[PDB]
Amino acid sequence: LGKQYVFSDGHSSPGTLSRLFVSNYSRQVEPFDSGFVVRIGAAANKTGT
């Protein structure tokens, strides 16, 4: 199954830009054992939240 990472838009208002909105990915450290592969853009051209 691997691991899922999701990015989001920052806080926005009509005519205004506000603080960013992210998860706690920066403080997580993963072991690099033999490398990894990344699947990118699998859910393209679809309605998403």
Ligand X SMILES: *[C@@H]1O[C@H](CO)[C@@H](O[C@@H]2O[C@H](CO)[C@@H](O)[C@H](O)[C@H]2NC(C)=O)[C@H](O)[C@H]1NC(C)=O
Residues that bind ligand X (CB under 6 A): 24, 27-28
Closest separation between CB of residue 2 and ligand X, Å?
Answer: 15
Closest separation between CB of residue 28 and ligand X, Å?
Answer: 5
Half-sphere exposure of 34 (CA within 13 A, CB side): 0
Residue among 28 and 34 whose Cβ is closer to ligand X: 28
Residue of 31, 8, 3 lying closest to 21 (CA atoms): 8
Residue among 5 and 14 whose Cβ is closer to ligand X: 5
Cβ atoms of residues 19 and 27 within 8 Å? no
